[PDB]
């Protein structure tokens, strides 16, 4: 009833680029030092 459970080229040797960028390199290097 209702009731239920529901309920390559590695060697580079960069030539001139370091010379070109040395200005910024030293700019950062002074503050880092």
């Amino acid at each position: 009833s209702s009731s239920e459970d529901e309920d390559a080229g590695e060697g580079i040797s960069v030539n001139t680029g370091p010379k070109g960028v040395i200005n910024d390199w030293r700019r950062f290097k002074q503050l880092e030092t």
């Binding site: 390559a8 080229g9 001139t16 680029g17 070109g20």
Partner: protein
């Protein structure tokens, strides 16, 4: 003064440029890396590669196809991108040759780098290569043989071409069976180039030798509830109608009444309209009904009452293939039954492949549409087999279009290179050196083929060169035991179109890359 190497900075942050040395070096390294990657998968003894995706899904793919390898790799080198696009275009134009064109372009660019190291202007190399390409193309065209007139010899050529195409793939284990399968599948197209008409079904389990080409057709769709599961002497009607509460296409229309009884009358009218649609369909005198779109419960109940099979949701490809294989017409209106052709087949039944049930059409009328069941031990095996079958079918269709054939096994490369060398021997200047480098790359192709098998590539290539210079225009590599032999006797033949496309595309891309002397990169988005 250079753009980047100037006291004043003219670039955004992250944008740079590469001048003569750096541009040529970047291009050559990229091209050589791509060629070395794609090679070692070349020839009958080429091996496969595993492609691990770095995405969340981490897709696994083992393959021998050069274009597939070159597509699924993160490439940042612009020259490598050029070579990858070359390989993709070669795959689009013809089936095989994706690895050969890439390796040839890489070898040409290596020779170009060597020549540039010898103080030769790149424009001189380009002119020499243009002349060499003209000579090689003329020689290859003159060496072509056509057998389209004779049916038996053309079928033999098709068998040989399919075998040569499949010799480098994982299907080389059952090369004979798979070659027969592919040749039958292509010949069933009745001369049509429609490769979409050939459906490849990959079912896991079973052996690769258990793969077969069905004599009829196989559909992976389902039948209705009360519909018959088996029809003999079927009369097919392929349709592309709505059949799912087919609303009148006046989208501004609405039901606007003052009582629910009128609403009930209107819904009864809609059901009557659907019933009349089904009655008009049945007026054609049919046993089976394939509709591209869905079929809802009321139309399928009507069909089951009529006792006719009703296959639903067969996509555009499905209905096109059924029309090709049975000869029916894809009809969207049913007011003129006499003007609509009905498909026919001897038997329709459900077959049990693996653990899945498919609809089988037997004794088809036309048959100009094939289904191929591929069985394998892994999903990777099934994918590689499907790719190899695609290559074989593409090459066979191209051969059907153009029946001219050339001899493989390095014979075509040897004869083209011999013609290039003959031209170079009567040319003054450094253009002769460029021509010799072109011939060197052409030699290097079968050299790599022989290297992949572990044979003495240098001696074999020297023997081939001597034989072709003497006049043995059909000499080629015999890969069964590592000697040289007659490619005509051994049946190592290729499509003339594939070889010519490989040659021309490789030369064109090498010329394109060689012209670059400055690579300028914009600042990336990231």
């Amino acid at each position: 003064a250079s753009l980047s190497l100037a006291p004043v900075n003219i670039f955004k942050a992250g944008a740079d440029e590469e001048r003569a040395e750096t541009a040529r070096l970047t291009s050559f390294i990229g091209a050589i890396a791509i060629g070395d990657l794609v090679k070692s998968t070349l020839g009958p003894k080429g091996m496969d590669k595993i492609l691990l995706s770095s995405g969340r899904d981490a897709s696994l793919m083992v393959t021998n196809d050069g274009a597939t390898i070159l597509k699924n790799i993160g490439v940042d080198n612009p020259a490598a991108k050029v070579l990858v696009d070359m390989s993709r275009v070669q795959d689009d134009e013809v089936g095989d040759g994706t690895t050969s064109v890439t390796v040839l372009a890489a070898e040409l660019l290596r020779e170009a780098e060597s020549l540039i190291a010898k103080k030769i202007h790149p424009q001189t190399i380009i002119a020499g290569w243009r002349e060499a390409t003209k000579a090689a193309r003329e020689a290859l065209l003159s060496s072509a043989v056509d057998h389209g007139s004779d049916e038996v010899k053309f079928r033999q050529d098709l068998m040989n071409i399919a075998g040569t195409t499949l010799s480098s793939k994982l299907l080389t284990h059952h090369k004979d069976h798979f070659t027969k399968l592919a040749v039958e599948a292509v010949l069933r197209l009745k001369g049509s180039g429609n490769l979409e008409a050939i459906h490849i079904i990959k079912k896991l389990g079973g052996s690769l030798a258990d793969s077969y080409l069905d004599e009829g057709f196989l559909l992976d769709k389902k039948i209705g509830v009360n519909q018959p599961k088996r029809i003999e002497n079927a009369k097919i009607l392929i349709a592309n109608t709505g059949m799912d509460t087919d609303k009148i296409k006046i989208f501004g229309s609405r039901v606007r009444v003052d009582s629910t009884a009128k609403v009930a009358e209107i819904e009864h009218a809609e059901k009557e309209k659907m019933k009349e649609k089904v009655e008009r369909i049945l007026k054609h005198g049919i046993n089976c009904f394939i509709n591209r779109q869905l079929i809802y419960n009321y139309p399928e109940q009507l069909f089951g009452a009529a006792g006719v099979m009703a296959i639903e949701h067969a996509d555009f490809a499905g209905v096109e293939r059924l029309a090709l294989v049975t000869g029916g017409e894809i009809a969207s209106t049913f007011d003129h039954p006499e003007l609509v052709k009905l498909g026919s087949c001897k038997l329709i039944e459900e077959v049990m492949i693996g653990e899945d049930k498919l609809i089988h059409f037997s004794g088809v009328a036309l048959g100009e549409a094939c289904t191929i069941v591929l069985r394998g031990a892994t999903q990777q095996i099934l994918d590689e087999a499907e790719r190899s079958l695609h290559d074989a079918l593409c090459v066979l269709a191209q051969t059907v279009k153009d029946s001219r054939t050339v001899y493989g096994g390095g014979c075509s490369e040897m004869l083209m290179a011999h013609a290039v060398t003959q031209l170079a021997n009567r040319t003054p200047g450094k253009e002769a050196v460029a021509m010799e480098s072109y011939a060197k790359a052409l030699r290097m192709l079968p050299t790599i083929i022989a290297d992949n098998a572990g044979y003495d590539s240098a001696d074999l290539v020297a023997q081939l060169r001597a034989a072709h210079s003497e006049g043995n225009t059909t000499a080629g590599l015999d890969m069964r035991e590592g000697t040289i032999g007659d490619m005509a006797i051994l049946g190592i033949t290729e499509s003339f179109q594939v070889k010519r496309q490989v040659l021309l595309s490789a030369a064109e891309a090498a010329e394109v890359i060689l012209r670059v002397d400055n690579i300028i990169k914009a600042a990336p988005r990231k």
